[PDB]
Each structure stands twice: as structure tokens, then as C-alpha cells.
Amino acid sequence: ATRAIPELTKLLNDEDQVVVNKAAVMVHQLSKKEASRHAIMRSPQMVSAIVRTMQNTNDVETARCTAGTLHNLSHHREGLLAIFKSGGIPALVKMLGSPVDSVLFYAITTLHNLLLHQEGAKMAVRLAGGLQKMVALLNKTNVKFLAITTDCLQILAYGNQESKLIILASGGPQALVNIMRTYTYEKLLWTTSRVLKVLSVCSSNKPAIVEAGGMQALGLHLTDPSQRLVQNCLWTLRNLSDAATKQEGMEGLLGTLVQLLGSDDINVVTCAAGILSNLTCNNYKNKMMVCQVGGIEALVRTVLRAGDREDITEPAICALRHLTSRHQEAEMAQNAVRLHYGLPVVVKLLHPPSHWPLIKATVGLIRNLALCPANHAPLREQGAIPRLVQLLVRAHQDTQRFVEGVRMEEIVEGCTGALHILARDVHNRIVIRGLNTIPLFVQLLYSPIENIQRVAAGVLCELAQDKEAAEAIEAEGATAPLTELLHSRNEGVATYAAAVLFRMS
């Protein structure tokens, strides 16, 4: 082994322009034999001459035979340490701009092997400007090469907000989204989705990914037989979904997310419910398409199937809340929840062991369902009013004296808001009045939150249309605060306060 070796090493070590071409091909033949290859290592001047000549040469093969070696030393744990000591990482990064496809494949594979097994390689690649060189290579068309490059990006970007921002400034988001819409190679698509997943938690990369059409691109692979690709797409879709409210062309994605609600895998259902909940927030167009593809019917079945798991019911109720208000077919959606046996389970979610986030969403859903007169009776028979009164009284006591991410003022306003809509029915008014709620409604007029005064005065206005209730509202001393509420900056508070005062006289 170390026979010719020390002699062979000296033949490239002398170097120069005529010898390097023959010394590069010969060290490549020596790298092809494992014996010598082991000897090629352990010689610092040899490995350091392979990398040095690689960045200086300009011939036709230039880096091929030299990088051909370091491709083979990269297979050895000792060779990975050798390339690390030789300073090949900055030079291999320099070859990420080389024109030859051979060196590009050999350089990206050597850095890849270094990034997986060589300690301190991630930091050295960053210092050499490798991140920018790798993002610029995303315009290639060889999927095997693109899979190796994106994996390096995921290795470097994971747990490194610095690297995520550098990828952003290099046009990473748009380049990675293009790979999603162009190729079908599962290994490349899965790895590219892993990079986009790591980028989607960054507040700066999330809008840029959304603007690049990432939501539509990720939706193309939601029907792929590879569960790891669909699950990674769904995780990335849920991260970006809060910033995708202005996106169009979502008809195909929204239809597939509805189908995924029937899946047996909880992570698929949990994500699809969360994405639909975010995409339907303040988007009447998305509310319409989701309703047209049977989204109400699918979300009720999902809430029924879920039961106790709040990771599914909380987003599914939130989506059901969005779909039942403020769009053209909202009235049909409020009827649809009833027709699909949804009213019993919705009122059930108001009771323990439900937590405050799910209870908050469920109250907002009941407020929207109560807008449909055909829901006034069944919501009463299911016991919605007595539970909503108990939630309102308890949340108001906590206010006078953030529980799981929910301020109790939101429960006060939501419960009083739902009761305001339910009070339109005359039988609900008897139930609401029989619970001695007027003394609390009058007290709610003094609340500092204007939105609480609005629903408090509105529900008092609905009750005051009966003489017995109007007389009771007067006996509660409600004339005094309603007089001050006539000067409210909120237009709704002033109009409701005038309606109760007129009915009292």
C-alpha cells in the first residue's frame, strides 16, 4: 500500500499544469482501489493538494478527477475527516457554480456526506456561502441532483433562523415552490416539502412562500400514495394558512381538504380541519366553495367522529363557525348543521371536559346557528340556553375578581352574543328570563368593553319587547346606564340603548 503511495503522493505534490491532468486521473484510479484510497488519505499534503488544484485548474476535466477522489474519500469516515482538515468545504462550495455537471454532482454529494456525518460541517458550509450557492442550483432539472441539494438545505436550515433568512434572500421560497409544481419524483418532493416545512415556521418566509403559490403547489400532492409526502404537505399547509386569506385558485385545494376530513389518520384529519378553519376566516369566496363541496356535512361527521380529541374538534368547530355566517350560502349552512345531526353534539361541546379554546369556538358557532329560525327550537330542546347562561355567569365572576389562552371577557361577550340571537324566539325569551339573567345583563352595560355593552343592550332590547320583561328591566335600574350608553362611540350600543328605553316607556 504505502509503497508507491509515498512515491505516488509526491508525483501530484510536485504538481504544475502538465502533471496535474495526469496526476488527477491517476489519483482517481488510485481512489478507485480501496487499498490505495486508504493510503491516499492520512497524507495531509496529498488531500490538501487535491482540493487546492481543484479550485485553481481550468482544463476540460478540471475538477472531475480530483472531485472524483473526494467523492470516494467521502465514503470513508476517515476521508470525511481528511476533507474537513484539508479545507475542501469552502472549495467544494466554490464548485457549486462550476459549469460541468459532473463536478456539480460530485461536489453536492461530498458536501452532503460531510453534512450528515462530519461534525462542524454545517457551520463551515454556511461560512463558505454554501446556502446561496445551493439555492442557485435549484434551477437544475436532474431530480437525483435536486434531491441531494434540497436535503443539504434542510440540514442547514433546520434549527437555524440565520440560514432560513439567507435562503429567503436567495429566492429559496419561489425556487422550492417551483420544484413542487414541476416534478413527480417522490424523494425530491418529500425533501423539498421538508425544507418548506422548516421555512414555514419563520415569520419572514411564510408570506414569501404563500406569494410564490406554495398553497396551490402543496395541494397538488395531497392525493399522493406516499403518506410522508402528504403529511409533510399538510403540516406546511397548516403553517402558512393564516397568511393565505388573499390567495385565489384555491378551489382544487379546498375540495381535497374536505375529502381528507374522512381519512382514518388523525394527523391528516387534524391538519385538514385546521387549514380549512384558517382559509375560511374572512374569505366569503372560500366559505362558498367549501360549502359547495359538502364541507358542512363533512365537518359535522368529523366533530362526531372526534368526540373528546380537541385537536380535531376545535378547528372543525372554528371552520363550522366561519361557514355559517357572512356569505351567500350561510343560511343553507346553518340549516345544514341541523339536518346532519349536528345540533346535539355542538351543545354537548359546551360542557366538560371541553377546554376554553373549544368552548369559545363552540359558542361562536351557536351564535351563528341561532341566526336560522329553524334552529331556535332544537337549540332550546338540546339545552343550549341554560348552559350558555352558566358559562356567562361564571366568566363574569372571574372578570370581577388568560385561562388556557382565552380571556374570560371573550366568553362573556360570546355567550351574551349567542343569547342575543336566541332571544329572537319568544319561547327562548321565556327561558332566558326565567333564569334571572336581567340583573346580569344590566350589570354588563357597565362593562369597559364596548362589544360587551353592544350584546348586553341588544339582548335587553330583544327581551324588552314583552311587557313583563321591560318592567323588570326598569326595576333593575337599567334606565341610568342606558342613558349614558346613548352617547356611545359605538353605533350599535347607542341604537340598542335607545330601543330598550323606548320600550320601557
UniProtKB/Swiss-Prot annotation:
GO BP of this protein: acinar cell differentiation; adherens junction assembly; anterior/posterior axis specification; apoptotic signaling pathway; astrocyte-dopaminergic neuron signaling; bone resorption; branching involved in blood vessel morphogenesis; branching involved in ureteric bud morphogenesis
Clinical condition linked: Colorectal cancer: A complex disease characterized by malignant lesions arising from the inner wall of the large intestine (the colon) and the rectum. Genetic alterations are often associated with progression from premalignant lesion (adenoma) to invasive adenocarcinoma. Risk factors for cancer of the colon and rectum include colon polyps, long-standing ulcerative colitis, and genetic family history. Activating mutations in CTNNB1 have oncogenic activity resulting in tumor development. Somatic mutations are found in various tumor types, including colon cancers, ovarian and prostate carcinomas, hepatoblastoma (HB), hepatocellular carcinoma (HCC). HBs are malignant embryonal tumors mainly affecting young children in the first three years of life.
Quaternary data: Two separate complex-associated pools are found in the cytoplasm. The majority is present as component of an E-cadherin:catenin adhesion complex composed of at least E-cadherin/CDH1 and beta-catenin/CTNNB1, and possibly alpha-catenin/CTNNA1; the complex is located to adherens junctions. The stable association of CTNNA1 is controversial as CTNNA1 was shown not to bind to F-actin when assembled in the complex. Alternatively, the CTNNA1-containing complex may be linked to F-actin by other proteins such as LIMA1. (Microbial infection) Interacts with herpes virus 8 protein vPK; this interaction inhibits the Wnt signaling pathway.
Example of a GO MF term: DNA-binding transcription factor binding
Result when mutating residue 322 to A: Abolishes TCF7L2 binding, and strongly reduces or abolishes LEF1 binding
General function of this protein: Key downstream component of the canonical Wnt signaling pathway. In the absence of Wnt, forms a complex with AXIN1, AXIN2, APC, CSNK1A1 and GSK3B that promotes phosphorylation on N-terminal Ser and Thr residues and ubiquitination of CTNNB1 via BTRC and its subsequent degradation by the proteasome. In the presence of Wnt ligand, CTNNB1 is not ubiquitinated and accumulates in the nucleus, where it acts as a coactivator for transcription factors of the TCF/LEF family, leading to activate Wnt responsive genes. Also acts as a coactivator for other transcription factors, such as NR5A2.
Outcome, altering residue 144 to A: Abolishes or strongly reduces AXIN1 and AXIN2 binding
Alphabetic keyword roster: Acetylation, Activator, Cell adhesion, Cell junction, Cell membrane, Cell projection, Chromosomal rearrangement, Cytoplasm, Cytoskeleton, Disease variant, Glycoprotein, Host-virus interaction, Intellectual disability, Membrane, Neurogenesis, Nucleus, Phosphoprotein, Repeat, S-nitrosylation, Synapse, Transcription, Transcription regulation, Ubl conjugation, Wnt signaling pathway
Region of interest: Interaction with BCL9: 8-30
Designated name of the protein: Catenin beta-1
Modified residues (Phosphoserine): 43, 98
Localization per Swiss-Prot or TrEMBL: Cytoplasm; Nucleus; Cytoplasm, Cytoskeleton; Cell junction, Adherens junction
Family: Belongs to the beta-catenin family.
Outcome after substituting residue 8 to A: Abolishes interaction with BCL9 but no effect on interaction with CDH3
Organism from which the protein derives: Homo sapiens
